[PDB]
């Protein structure tokens, strides 16, 4: 246990054999400053107000993705090809701010204890798929080296719409719905 | 289900008391298991598991790897504090304090940053503790927290309730009243 006022991750470097795929992010005190888009080779900010402090050469990431790609192969061998244990994620659904009908708000779907980092998170409005007003965080890191991820639905709380968050995972026998109604 | 194998490599910087005590750690993880660590307080690569013994042995002999990991605290950690972290530590977002009944009264302190918050409840300018429950800080995932602090109340005509909030972004506390209808 390391005591500190603050802690950055100047590089969470995620690489997995399934895909294969990767992710490169920096985090300051639990929050994602930026990510690197590995297909596009382009640094990207989910929350643009943070470009203001710190650019980043996409090349630095693609570099470490190469190393991880190499090292994962080494480490697979040493561990006798020991496949990752699927975890059972904890979904919870809550609002950003207090609920007032007619007041625009953002719904927050929190998927904790994600492992491995493979999850489809969609929203449902009256049991139908919503694509409008949905956005995500990247896979955020945890000291037990599992991940969490957070999807957002912006919405107009109405007389009747009923919302669900649909989470799909390999630790889940069947797509898991979490409900939220005004 | 598809069989997967996972590699995580984290470079972490731990700051304390401005930039006086700084401490660099790197973890090399297979699935959920950190197998080899470099820790600026230890000084060299340590194996956390059996599987990390020879990796750390090797790296530790390479003059150039060892030396590079040692410089990391000053070259990377201390640099990022200057480029980003210091300004991020300047970030102040004010809490929105709102009282609503669900006999239970819910003070909902929302949208704030940084994380440090005090929240107190009152019944008639007298602090109420026995009847308070709080959530942990909740992380919104945008750059804000929120927190919900409940007072268990048996309302009477006349009574004034006050949710009282202190946060680094506020020069003076926020108070929000709720009068028994």
């Amino acid at each position: 246990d390391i005591v500190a006022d603050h802690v950055a991750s100047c590089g969470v470097n995620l690489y997995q054999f399934y895909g294969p795929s990767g992710q490169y992010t920096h985090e300051f005190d639990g929050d994602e400053q930026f990510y690197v888009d590995l297909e596009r080779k382009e640094t990207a900010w989910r929350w643009p107000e943070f470009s203001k402090f710190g650019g980043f050469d996409p090349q630095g990431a693609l570099r470490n993705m190469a190393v991880a790609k190499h090292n994962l192969n080494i480490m697979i061998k040493r561990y006798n090809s020991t496949a990752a244990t699927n975890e059972v994620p904890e979904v919870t659904v809550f609002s950003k701010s207090p609920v007032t009908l007619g007041q625009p708000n953002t719904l927050i779907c929190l998927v904790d204890n994600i492992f491995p980092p493979v999850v489809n998170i969609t929203w449902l409005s009256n049991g139908q798929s919503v694509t409008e007003g949905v956005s995500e965080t990247s896979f955020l890191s945890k000291s037990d080296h599992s991940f969490f991820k957070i999807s957002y639905l912006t919405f107009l709380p109405s007389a009747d719409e009923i919302y669900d968050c649909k989470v799909e995972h390999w630790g889940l026998d069947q797509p898991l719905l979490k409900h939220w109604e005004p | 289900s598809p069989e997967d194998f996972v590699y995580q490599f984290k470079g972490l910087c731990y700051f304390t008391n401005g930039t006086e005590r700084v401490r660099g750690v790197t973890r090399h993880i297979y699935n959920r298991e950190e197998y080899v660590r470099f820790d600026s307080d230890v000084g060299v690569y340590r194996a956390v598991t059996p599987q990390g013994r020879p990796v750390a042995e090797y790296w530790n002999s390479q003059k150039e790897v060892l030396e590079g990991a040692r410089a990391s605290v000053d070259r990377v950690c201390r640099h990022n504090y200057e480029v980003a972290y210091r300004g991020i530590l300047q970030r102040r977002v004010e809490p929105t304090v709102t009282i609503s009944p669900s006999n239970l009264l819910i003070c909902s302190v929302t949208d704030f940053y940084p994380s440090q918050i005090k929240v107190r409840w009152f019944r008639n300018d007298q602090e109420e503790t026995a009847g308070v429950v709080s959530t942990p800080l909740i992380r919104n995932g945008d750059w804000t927290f929120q927190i919900l602090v409940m007072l268990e109340m048996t309302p009477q005509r006349g009574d004034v309730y006050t949710c009282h909030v202190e946060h680094p972004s506020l020069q003076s506390p926020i108070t929000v009243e709720w009068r028994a209808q």
Epitope: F56, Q59, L62, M65, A66, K69, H70 | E64, G68
Partner: T-cell receptor, first 111, second 114 residues
Framework: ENVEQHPSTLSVQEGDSAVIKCTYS??????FPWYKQELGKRPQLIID?????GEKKDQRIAVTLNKTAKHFSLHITETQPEDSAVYFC???????????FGTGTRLTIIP | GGAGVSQTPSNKVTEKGKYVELRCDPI?????LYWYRQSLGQGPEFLIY????????DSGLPNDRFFAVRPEGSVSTLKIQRTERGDSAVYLC??????????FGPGTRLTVLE
């Protein structure tokens, strides 16, 4: 990106000193090696300099660096004919480790 | 590998449309391998960069007829597919302990003829 190198060809008397100037664009460049290349051979790494120092000296050879004006040059003093080769400056940055080279200077030391 | 970066042969002479491989045995222990191309008259230009077994940067490969491998994170072969006159250059190889400081090999001059 890009690195510019002058002069194109240089002739100096045995004994006199020779100077090649270079200039780079990407301000993030932190490492600047120089190479000597003899004909039919690959580039030989003879000296390098990083953005935390202004000057480096190694025997007859000297390298300089102005990080604010993005200039860096190479000084070869007391030249000897063995010095006759093509010289290259290159530049590299912390996140992009590939070298981007200059157009070459063809040094000729007249014996 | 050796004490320095080796490439053999010094020269490969072929005709159009034929397949050419350029080998490169790294300085033993060196984790990063780079392939550069030098059209003579001008300086070296980047093709590909390996970190261990994998490609860190392939941006310099001139077209889809170029591909490079390094199956054991050691020796690396550069494969050129359907060869054209315009591919005539010297192919330098450089390696590095970690990535920054690069030591070149003698290069292989590919000479592609009608």
């Amino acid at each position: 990106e890009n690195v510019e190198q002058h002069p194109s060809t240089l002739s100096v008397q045995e004994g006199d000193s020779a100077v090649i100037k270079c200039t780079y664009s990407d301000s993030a460049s932190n490492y600047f090696p120089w190479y000597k290349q003899e004909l039919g051979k690959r580039p030989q790494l003879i000296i390098d300099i990083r953005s935390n120092v202004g000057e480096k000296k190694d025997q007859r050879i000297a390298v300089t660096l102005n990080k604010t004006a993005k200039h860096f040059s190479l000084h070869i003093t007391e030249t000897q004919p063995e010095d006759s080769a093509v010289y290259f400056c290159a530049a590299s940055s912390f996140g992009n480790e590939k070298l981007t080279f200059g157009t070459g200077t063809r040094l000729t030391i007249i014996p | 590998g050796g004490a320095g970066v080796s490439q053999t042969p010094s020269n490969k002479v072929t005709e159009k449309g034929k397949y050419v491989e350029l080998r490169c045995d790294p300085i033993s222990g060196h984790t990063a391998l780079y392939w550069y191309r030098q059209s003579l008259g001008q300086g070296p230009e980047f093709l590909i960069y390996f970190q261990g077994t994998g490609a860190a940067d392939d941006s310099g490969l001139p077209n889809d007829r170029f591909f490079a491998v390094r199956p054991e994170g050691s020796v690396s072969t550069l494969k050129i597919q359907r060869t054209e006159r315009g591919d005539s250059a010297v192919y330098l190889c450089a390696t590095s302990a970690l990535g920054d400081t690069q030591y070149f090999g003698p290069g292989t001059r590919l000479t592609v003829l009608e």
